[PDB]
Amino acid sequence: RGKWTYNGITYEGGGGSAAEAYAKRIAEAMAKG
Known part of the structure; x- marks a missing residue:
């Protein structure tokens, strides 16, 4: 909510x-083939 700096x-x-922090990482785990 509102760009930061x-x-x-x-x-x-x-x-x-x-x-x-962990989520961003899991971002990968999420993806799969």
């Missing part, structure tokens, strides 16, 4: 969670 770069995608 990390290093003078406006990020997108709602908001950045900390717990999602």
Whole structure:
């Protein structure tokens, strides 16, 4: 909710969670062939 500012770069995608840390990773596991 509202772009943030990390290093003078406006990020997108709602908001950045900390717990999602693992999620972002799982992002791969999710995918499969």
